[PDB]
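Q: What would this complex look like in 3D?
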Amino acid sequence: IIPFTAQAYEELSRQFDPQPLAMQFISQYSPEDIVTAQIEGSSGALWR
Amino acid sequence: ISPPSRAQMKRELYNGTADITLRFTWNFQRDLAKGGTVEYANEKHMLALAPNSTARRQLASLLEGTSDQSVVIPNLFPKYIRAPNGPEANPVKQLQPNEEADYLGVRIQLRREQGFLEWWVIELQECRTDCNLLPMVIFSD
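A: Here is my prediction, written as structure tokens for the whole assembly.
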């Protein structure tokens, strides 16, 4: 999990800047707020 | 551990210069009937695994194929923990002065007895019956 930095936050906000409310969400949430969901995908755990 | 990442874990202990996060989370879930807001008192006692250290070289051979390596984890099993009704398994300082070097010498033994049948016994540096029953203490509040 990566706590998004100020620069990272700017990136996300700019990605969704065209849509006002999209950018709003990101921008309103404080920097080091938006966290990165780097969920693991590898298995190993077989299933039962 | 997923096979590609198991081989990567291997590699780390084998060579890969990285520090495996050995978070020894000591979660202490109590109850709420007798009170205890965040009953679960937890603390990840992490041991950054120095790349190919004595412990990690034992782990290299552990994950190579042999199952007879007593991985020396420098005193990292809190034998006295002042846990309260909050979410923290903080050990008592002075009870364990170093409290990272005065916890309790813990050992690890992966028992891959192909028949890999990878088991994992948590031993002690001085395991008497603490390979199956490690006796620490939680100073409860």
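A: To summarize the key features: Residues 38 and 44 of chain A are 18 Å apart (CA to CA). The longest strand of chain A covers residues 2-3.
Q: Very helpful, thank you.
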